[model samples]
Target chain A: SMLERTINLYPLTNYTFGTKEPLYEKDSSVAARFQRMREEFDKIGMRRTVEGVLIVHEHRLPHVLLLQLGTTFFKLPGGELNPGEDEVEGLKRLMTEILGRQDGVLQDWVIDDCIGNWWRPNFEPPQYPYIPAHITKPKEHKKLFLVQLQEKALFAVPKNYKLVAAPLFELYDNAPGYGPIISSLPQLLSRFNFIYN
Target chain B: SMLERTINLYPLTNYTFGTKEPLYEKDSSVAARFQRMREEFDKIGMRRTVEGVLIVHEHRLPHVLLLQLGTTFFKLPGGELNPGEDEVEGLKRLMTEILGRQDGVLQDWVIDDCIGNWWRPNFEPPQYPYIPAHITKPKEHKKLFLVQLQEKALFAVPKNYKLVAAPLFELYDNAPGYGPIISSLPQLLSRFNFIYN
Candidate 1:
C-alpha cells in the first residue's frame, strides 16, 4: 500500500536567483544538433537524456521553472547525458552547468522520484508516452526527474536564458506553446501532494 | 540513479474473473447519491475516496480493468473511505470489497504505487487534475493507485458490475468516453516502466 509522495514548495519570492555568465551549447546549430545525434546513435544505439522538474509556489498554486529561449522556445534545465553517465549524477552536473553559480555555492538537488519518461521513436520529433507497437528501435529515451528544492535557496541563472516560473494552467493542454512533453506537465505532476509554504 | 519503478504485466488471458453475487449500490438512485454526498459533506467536511487501477497485458500492451455498470457508467474498483482511515488500507479494503473472492482463496494485492491525485472543488460532476486557483476548500479528494496484479489470479466480481479490460488507446484523450479522471490515466501512467510478460 502506498500514498503519493509529498512535495513542499516554497513561495517564489522566498528563493532568489540572479544572472551569471552565458553557457554555450555543445552543438553549434540546429542542424548540428541532429547531426551529432545521428552519429551518437550509430555508436551508442540510443540517446539517453534527462530533464529536471523544479517547482515553486505562487498564488497558492505550483509553478514550474522553465528556461525561456528567445520569444517562444521553452525547455527544462537539463541536457543529454554523457555516454554511460549515471542519470542522477549527470542530472546534477547538468543542472549546475545551466543554473549553478560560476563562483559556486552548494546547491542540493535531491532527485529521489522520477516524474515521467518519453521515447523518441525517430531522430526528428514525435515522442509517445509509451513505445508504440510499430517502433522496434527507439532513437532516444528521455527520463524526467523531479529535482527537489530546499525551503529557501539561491540560483545563478545562465545569462543566455531567462528562467520563467509558469503556472500549471499555463502549461496544461497547451501543446502548441510548450511541446507535448512540457505541455502535459500538468497531468504528469497531478500525482504529487504539493504543500504550499 | 533511480529509474522509474518497473511494473510487470502478464497476458490478460492468464487471469480470469467471473461474477458471483449482486453487489447492491450504497445509494439507491442518482439523486440519493448526491443527497448522501451533501449530508456526508456537512458532517465529514470532505470525502476521501480511493480508486484502484489494475493492469493486465495483451498483445504486448497494458490494459486497465474497469467495472462497467449497465450500458455506460464505468468505474474503478474502489469506493469512499471512512473517516480517518489510512488511504492505502482503505483502498485494500475497498478492492477486496469490490473484487475480492466470495469464498476467495488467498489473494496478494501489491499496492506500492500511487498513480495520481484529483480534487473535486465542489460536490458536482466537475473534477480537475489540480486544485483551481479560486477554490479554497475542496469537497472531495480522490486518490488513484496502481494495483499490482500477479502473473495469475481469479476475481469473483459483483453480479451487478461487468468487469471490463480497457486498452490505453481506448482511454487516451477520450474524455468524452471516460470521465476527466479516468481519461487522464494515459498521462498519469506514462511514468511507469511496464515489462510485458
Candidate 2:
C-alpha cells in the first residue's frame, strides 16, 4: 500500500507503469515531488487543470453546459500548492492563476483519460509521433473539472493568451471538418456514460 | 447575435473576413473541405471525436492504449467525410475507425461543441507565437461528432506501434511542477457549454 499510496500521490491515475523513483528523496517537499511526478506525466501526455468555471448561455444546441479551463503551459495557471492540499485544493489554486480571482465552487471532478505525452520527442519543433528523446514512454493524463459558475463572469486572459478549442467528446463523425464548440460537450457526456453505464 | 454566430463558426464563421477564394475553387468535396477545416481547428487546439482508449492498472500505470486507426500523421478523429455522404453517415464511418474492430459496443450519439476556430498561440512549436514550420491552419467551417464506447474494454497496443502523446495538454503541465487536473476540463467544455448550457 505504500507503493500504491506513493503512486497515488503522483500522476499515476492515467499511467501504466511507475518509472524510476525520484532521484532525491527526503530533501524534496511533497510539492516538489509532485512537481517532478507532474513532469514525468507531462513527458507522457497528462494535462493539468489550469482553471475551472461555470458558464451559462442561451443556444439552440443544448442546455446547461459544463466547462473546464486547461492549457499546456504552466505559467497561465501556476501557483504553490498549500500545506496538506490535496488535488482539489491544488486545482483551486490553478483556477486563481488563470482568473486572478477566485470563486467558491468545487463540486465535482473526473480523471478523464490517460493519454500520450504531448511534450516530449519533438518539443523544439513539435512534430507529431514525437520522437522519444526527452523521456522513455512519456504519457499524459487529462483531468477535467466541472465547476459551477455563480453568475456570468469575465475572466481575464492575457492579451497574448492562447486558448485551444478542445473537443467536448470524441468525434465519431467526419474527422477534419468539425471544431470544438459542438464537439466537447458530447464528449463530456460520453465520459459521463462511461462512469454510469 | 452576430458575434455569437461568428464564434460559432469561428475562423470561417466571419461575416465578411475573407474575400480571396480557394486556390482550386472547384467546390471541393465535403471530405476535402472538412479535412481542411479540421486542420485549422487542430492548429487552434480543437479536437474532434476519435477517442483513444488507454489502460491503467492499479499499481502499474498505463499498460497499453489504443489510438484511433488512421493515417500515421496527426489528424482529426472520424474518417474522411465520404463523397455524397450526409454528416450522420460520415459519423458512422469515423466511429469504425476507432471502435469497429470487434472491440467495443456502439451506442447513441450526441452533438458536442459547435464553435469554430478557438486558437491557442503556443500550438505552434519552438515557443514561437507565429506559425511553426511544420504546421498549417484549417481554412473552413468544421463539424465535430461524439460517439460513446458502450463496453469496458482493454486495448492492446500492438508491439512496435508507436505512441504519440498530446503535447498541448500534457507536456505543458510538467514544465514546472505539479499542475491541476480537475480544473482544466472547462477549456474543452466551455466550447460546448456555449451550445449545451
Candidate 3:
C-alpha cells in the first residue's frame, strides 16, 4: 500500500500524526453494525448522524483531524445517534468512544460551533449541501460541527484507524478524493476568524 | 416611546437600515399563530423552528441582518417548519415570505452552511447548549443556518417590523438585549474566517 513511498513524502507534508496506544471498537462485528442501522430505521425512519470536525493549527494554518481506514478511506470521528438523543450529547459520546482514552478521567471536548448540515435524499452516496426541492422524505440528516481542541492534548486512535491531520489546501475542491462534505468544508469554514494559539 | 432617541444613537451606529415600504403579516392575528403551533405540536410532537443568519460586511466588519419588532425586540428571518417540510426549504419559504419582493422575480438566497442548534426542554425561555441528562423530550428544536446574500439587494420590511443590522460586538454576551440564541452567535460564529467580498 505504498508504505515505503509515504516515508519519502511524510517529511515534506505540512501535517503530522502520532501512533499512540491502540484503541478497539465497541462493536467488532460488521453484521451487527448494519443490523442495528436497519433495525433502527424501522422504528425511526430517518437516520440522524453527527460528525465532529476537530481543527488544530500547525505552521499558522488550520488542520482537520480525520480517521483513516486503510489506504483509500478516511472520515471524521462520529456515529449515528440512537432514538431520542440530543445532537450535542450524542456527538460528544461518540467522540469519547472513538478518541478518548481508556483512563478513568474524561477528556474535555469543547463542541460549540456548527460547521454545516447535509441531507441524503435517499439511502445512497449522494448527499447535498442543502436539501433539494424535489426531495421531501430524506433518508438521512447529517450534521457537521466544529470541535474545539485544546492547545495541546493526547488522543488514542482505534487499532484499525490511523489519525491524519489534513491541511485546508488538500481538502479544497477535492470532492472526488474526500467526498462532498469533507471537500466543501473549506468554503463552509471560510466564514471564521481563527486566532491560532 | 422615545422615537427620536434612535436619532441620537442611530447616527453613531456603524450599521444602517432602510424603510422602503411596509410589508404585512401573513397571519393577521396572534391567536391563530399560537393555535397553529399547538395543533402542529400535537401532530409532530416537537416544534422544529429554523432561522437564517444573514450577514453583510460594512466598514470591513460583518453585520448580521435582524428584524426588529417595536423598539426593543429583534430576531432573524425564520419561522416554524410545517410537518413533512424540509428544513432548508422551509427556511427559504419563510425568508421569501418576509424579505422577497412580490413582483414575480425571485431573490437569490444562497443558504448552504448551518451555524448552530438550540433546544428548549419544556416550552420555556431557558435553552441549554446541550440537552441536560434529565430531559428526555425537548419541546422545541431550533436550528440556525447562514444565508448568503448577493453583493447587493433591496428588501422591503414589514410595516410592523424594522430591519436592523447588528455588528458582532453589539451581539456578544448581550443575552438580555437579543435573547439567548442570538446572544451566543458571536462565540458560536467565532470559528469562521469571513471574507468581505
Candidate 4:
C-alpha cells in the first residue's frame, strides 16, 4: 500500500497574464534592457522553452532557485528547448548551463514531474523603444518541470546571472519582477501542498 | 545536429464522446454484460484509468495491440492507476498483466511520452438497465502513453482477453466498437506520422 501511494498528481495550471504598464514606465533603463531581451528572443524564433523549478530542502523548508538577470528582473533558471530536444535532456542542459555544472553532475537531480504549461500569445514587448508597425505571432509556450536537487550537492552560478535560493513561501514576495512567477504562486502552492502536506 | 532533434510533442486531445444508441440496442447480450462490468467498476470507486498504446513494428509497419473484452466490444489494453502510482509504472503493469508477460519483460518497452489525457465529467454509463435517481461523478480520466515494444519479442494474451494486433492505419476500422478509441484515431495517426514519415 505504501508503494501504491507513491505518485502524486497536480493540476497543470496554464499561466498567462498581461504585463503591468508601471513596470516599464517607472524604470526606463530596465524597460529598455528587457525590451532588447525580448527582441533577441523574437529574433531566434523561439516557440517553446523548458523551465525548471529547482527545489532543495534546507533547514526543513523547501527552497527554490531563482535567477536574477539584472537589477530589476528575476526568473526561473531555464532556457529554450532546442527544436527537437527531449524535455528531460533539454532541461538538464539548461540547468547545467545556468548552474555551471559539469555534464555528469546533473544525473543526480531527480526530475519529479511536469508541473504546468504556460502560454503567451503574440504580443508587443512590454517597453519597446519604438511602436511596432505590425503584429507578429511569436508565441511562447513554456513547460514547467519540478527538479529535486540532492541535499549534499554544491551549486555554482554562471558569471552573468545571480542565483537566489528563496524559501518557497517567500518566492512571490522576493521575485516580484516577473509577472508569470507571481501569477504561478497559487499553483506552486498547490504543488507544495501535494508534496509536503 | 540530428541528435538534437529528439523530442516530439503531441496535443493531449480530450477523448469524451456521446455513445451512439445503436451499440446498446443492437446487441442485448453485449449490453447486459457491459452494464455489469460498469457496476463492478463503480463499486471500486475508480475515478481514473491509464490506457497504453502498445505499439510494435511488424512487416515494416506499426501495429497496435487492442483487446477484445467480449464478442462485440474491443478496447485498448489498459487498467486503472493504483492510487498514487506513477503513470509510466501503472501503464507498464497493465501491459504486463494483459500480455501475460513475466514482471521484468515490460522493462524492455520504451515509454515515449504521454500522448493524451482524456477526461469525462459526471456521466452515467451507457445502456444501464435502470435509471438512476441521483447522479454521481464516476469520472474517468484516462492518460494515454505511447509505449514502444521491443523488436522480436513474442507476446502472450491472458486467458479472458483476446489480443488483436491491428495495423496502425486500420485501428479505427478494427476497433470501431469503442467510442474513445475511434475518437483518438486522428491524434494517433498524427503520432504515427511523426514516427514513420
Candidate 5:
C-alpha cells in the first residue's frame, strides 16, 4: 500500500509540449491543459509518472541529434523506478524490460540532464491548481535520468522494441529544440583526424 | 575479511610545475629513482605504487610559465567502493570526506574531465623496463575524476582544508596540484558562463 501510495505521488511537471507537432498550437492552451490534468490525477489519488530512456548512437552526430527530442506526453512501456533503486540499475532493468533484450557489456556513460513539467486544466479558462499528492507539493514533477551506454567491441539496439505502460509519467519528445544533446568529443576527434597526417 | 584485504586502486595524475622545489634536477635519474621507490612500497605491501608525472601545459615566449603534474601512488580512502556505489558517487563521497564540506546550490554546475591513459612499461627503453609499471596485459582503468570547482558562490572549495593522508597520492612532477587547478577554473568558468547566459 505504501508503494502504491508512493507511486501515486510521482512528481509531474506542470508543462507539456507536443511530439513532432507544431509548438505554436500546443503553446496556445498548454497551461490550461496541464492544470486540468493535474486536477484529474489529484481526484483519482494519482500523481505523475517516471520514465527512463536509452538512445543508441553509432556516430557522434547521432548523440547530439537525439537531444532535440525534448518533451511530450507519451505512454511508455516500462516499469517505474523503484524508490531507493540505483539509477543505473533501474535504467538497465527498464531498458531490458522494454527491449526484451539485455547487454552483457553495458556501461552507463553519463547523466546528461533532467527536466520536469506541471499539470494543466481542460477548460478555455480553467481554474485548477496542481493537486499536491503525498508530498505537500505539485505532482507534475517527474524525474528522468538520461543515460548513454558504451561498448568497445560493438553495440546495437534491439530490432523490435516494445512499450509497456504501467502508470508512470511518460513524455517522449520527438520534436526539435528538446531532443538530445550535441557532445563535442566526437566532433573534435573527427576534426583532428582531418587536420593531422 | 575480504574487504580488508581488497585494495583500492586510483589513477592519479600528479601535476607539477616550477615551484619552490625542483621535481628532478638535471642528470637526475628519474626512472631509477622511481624504481627504488617502488621496491620500498612493495616491501610494505604497496607493490601497486605506480608513480609518474605529465606535463600538461608549458610556455616560454614572453613569460616562462610551466604547469606540470605527475601521477603517483595513492591508497584510496576507506576500502573499495561500497555496494551500489558508482564512480561518480565514489568521487563525491571521497571529495566530501577529504574536503570536509557539502556542495552548495548549483552543485551540478561543476564539470569533470576524464582522460584515458594507455602507455605500457615496455614502451620505454629495455634497460628501463622497470621504469613504467610492468604489465603482462592491458588493463581497464578509471582515474580520479578531474573536477574544477568554480570559485563562485555555488562551487567554492571547502575552507581551511587539510586533506587527510589516507586518500593521499604522490605528486610526481610537482606538489599537490591544487594551485594550478584553481588557476585553470577561471578560464573554464568564462566558457561556462557563455553557455549558461
Candidate 6:
C-alpha cells in the first residue's frame, strides 16, 4: 500500500506545452482555470528528472542547447524518467524524442558524465508560489548529465519549442528559467574547461 | 595550460586491491610509505566516482553485495569512471569486471536508479583527521546507483577481496569504514520499500 502510494505521488513537472489543451488556451474562467491547475498540481509530489547539458563545439567554441517554451521560459531539454528505465537510457530517449525532429539533428550525441544534481525542496507558497501547494515532500531531484556531439552539429527547432545554441559562458546571464544551471554556470564551465570568452 | 592542470588534478581514489605492489605491501620504510601515500593523495583534488548498490533478492529477502578489503575496510563494488566514459556503462563494466569471476555470477544484474549522490568535501586534517591532508580540494563525489540482479546468483571473490551478501537493514549497523553508506542506509531502504526487519 505504501509502495502504491509513493508511486502514485511520483513527482512530475506541470509541463503542458505539447499536450492537447495548452495552458494558455484554456477557455475556462481565471478562477476555474486556477482551480483546475491547483487540482492537477496536487497530484504531483516529488519526482526524479534528467537534464542534459547538451554541448556542441563549433570552431573550437562550445555552446549549450537550451529549450525555450513559448517566448519566456527557458529550460534544458529533458523529461521524467519512466519507471524501470535506466537514467542514461531514459535521457537519451528523451533527447532523441525532443531534439530529433524532422531532420534528426541530434542522433550522434553521446553522454559524457553526470556532472551535478539539483535538489529543490517541496514548494511553499511564498518560496515557490508558482508551484502548486499540493506538491509537497520528498523534494524534486534533477540529475544533470554532460552530453556532447561527436562534432559540430546543426539543430532544428521542434514545433512549439525554440532551441538555441547559447554560448556556454553566457548562459548564466542569458538563460532565465533554470535557476540551478544559471547559478552553477561558472563552476560547470570551469569544471569542464570551457572558456567563457 | 589551465585545462592541462585541471585534467591532471582530476580526483581519484587510490583503490588498490588486485593490482601488483599493493599500497599496503610496499617494502619501503614507514616514512617512505607515508611520503608515497601523501604524494598520491595530493594529486587527487575533487573527483566524481560511481558506486553500485548491487541488490539481489535471495529467498524473498534483499541482499546487497559489499567488497571487503583485508580485515577492516568494506566498500561497494565500484571505481572511477575512466575519462570520457559514460557513467552507467562505466559502472556496469566495473561491476562485471569485479564480480564476474570464473562462474560469471554477476552478468545479469541491471541498473535500477541513480539512488543518491554522496559528497565528501576536501580533507581537512583537524576536522577529518582520519583522512590524510595531502588529499585536499576537489571533494569526492560518489554517485550511488541501485543495481538489481535478474535472479539469485552466487558471487566469486577476486584475489585479495572478499564479497559479502549483507542484509539491507543490517548494513547501517554492521558496515564499517564507509560513513556515507551506513548513515544513509535507513533513508535509502525506505525509498526502495525494503523492509527494515
Q: Which segments of candidate 1 are over 4 A away from where they belong?
A: A24-36, B24-32
Error of 5 at A141 (Å): 2.5
In model 2, the Cα lDDT at residue B43 comes to 57
Q: What does the lDDT read for residue A4 in candidate 3? A: 10
Worst 10 residues of 1 chain A by lDDT: A125-134
Write candidate 5's Cα lDDT for B78-163 as tens digits.
11233345555555554444322243222332223321112224313222111122344321122322243232222122232212
Which tens-of-lDDT digit does each residue in A23-61 have in candidate 4? 112235756745654775767664566777865433334
| Fnat, one value per model | 0.66, 0.00, 0.00, 0.00, 0.00, 0.00
DockQ of 3: 0.02
> Which runs in model 6 stand beyond 4 Å of their true positions?
A1-197, B1-45, B57-60, B103-106, B124-137, B173-178, B193-197
The lDDT ranking, best first, is: 1, 3, 6, 4, 2, 5
- Model 2: lDDT of residue B183: 16
Give the alpha carbon lDDT tens digit for every residue of B1-197 in model 2.
01111111111111111112111222256566546545655555443322222212212111112232232323233433443455555565654443343344443333332212122233221121111233354122134332222223322232323233232234222323212211122232222211210
Name the top lDDT candidate: 1
TM-score, A chain, model 6: 0.62
Which consecutive 10 residues in model 6 chain A have the weakest lDDT in total? A1-10
TM-score of chain B of 3: 0.81
Q: Going through the candidates in order, state the TM-score of chain A alone for each one.
A: 0.95, 0.36, 0.81, 0.62, 0.33, 0.62
Residue A168 Cα positional deviation in candidate 6, in Å, after optimal superposition: 30
Candidate 4, residue B65: Cα displacement in angstroms equals 36
Which residue pairs in candidate 4 have backbone atoms (N, alpha carbon, C) closer than 3 angstroms, thus clashing?
A7-B84, A84-B6
**lDDT over C-alpha atoms for residue A188 of model 2:** 34
* Candidate closer to the true structure by TM-score (higher is better), 1 or 2: 1
